[PDB]
Design a protein around this ligand. Structure first.
Ligand SMILES: [Zn+2]
Length: 262
């Protein structure tokens, strides 16, 4: 199999006598295929940054082992040059404790696995065909610093209402240093959706949220300048192309075949 770096893949395996799916030492959790009761699923994701050239997974069954080979593809990522506030790439030493704190909090959330579906059918995606910066765009900040885009940016006037892409539990709902007013929702199965750069936050941590419920208003408080929604997905432990992820998830989990938007 082949997978573009920075993308997720839904792996389908026989359910009968299955024990474990392992990358190297890492256990990859599995969950029931929602339509085919002879199959189970796992989410496998490749990092955008420094991915392996090839991956070998092993599925352990009671009486056999199966090897799954995945070759990393480079894809067709583009690039942009951006001017940002200097503080966003050179934070003063005195604020780096706050950044380190917010990193530890985020890591605790993403390393906590919810072994049940909190979502409800397909993810909604924004009704918006003006992507100002796609996932994985290579970036040069202020002519000298490099990065890559870890989510997808949609042109939106400040104050555009933002609705949860699916049901789940809110895990983050505050201003964070780099990407501003931020909401993160746990959907179960290690799937998290992210909404950054907001001007207003209308949810609170621990709140159960339904698909299509208002979580805030779009803003211009993010790392990059300009009014936009930053939308992200973390799945399989990695930031992945969120529009691509939603397309693959929805093909499996949608309850109706119609168009999925709020
Ligand atoms: Zn962004």
């Amino acid at each position: 199999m082949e997978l573009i770096k920075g993308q997720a893949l839904f792996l389908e395996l026989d359910k009968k006598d299955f024990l474990s799916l392992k990358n190297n030492d890492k256990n990859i959790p599995t969950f029931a295929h929602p339509k085919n009761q002879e199959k189970i699923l796992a989410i496998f994701s490749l990092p955008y940054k420094n991915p392996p050239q090839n991956t070998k997974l092993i599925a352990f069954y009671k009486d056999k082992k199966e090897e799954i080979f995945i070759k990393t593809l480079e894809g067709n990522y583009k690039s942009e040059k951006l001017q940002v506030e200097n503080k966003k790439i050179f934070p003063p030493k005195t604020i780096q404790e706050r950044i380190a704190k917010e990193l530890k909090e985020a890591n605790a959330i993403y390393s906590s696995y919810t072994p049940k579906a909190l979502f409800n059918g397909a993810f909604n995606i924004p009704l918006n065909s003006f992507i100002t910066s796609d996932f994985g765009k290579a970036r040069t900040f202020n002519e000298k610093v490099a990065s890559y885009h870890s989510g997808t940016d949609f042109r939106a006037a400040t104050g555009t209402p933002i609705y949860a892409a699916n049901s789940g539990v809110v895990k983050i709902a505050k201003d964070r240093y780099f990407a501003g007013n931020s909401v993160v929702i746990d959907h179960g199965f290690g799937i998290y959706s992210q909404y950054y750069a907001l001007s207003k936050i209308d949810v609170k941590v621990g709140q159960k949220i339904k698909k299509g419920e208002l979580i805030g208003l779009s803003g211009a408080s993010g790392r990059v300048s300009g009014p936009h929604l930053h939308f992200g997905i973390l799945a399989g432990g990695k930031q992945v192309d969120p529009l691509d992820f939603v397309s693959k998830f929805n093909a499996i989990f949608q309850l109706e075949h119609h168009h999925h938007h709020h």
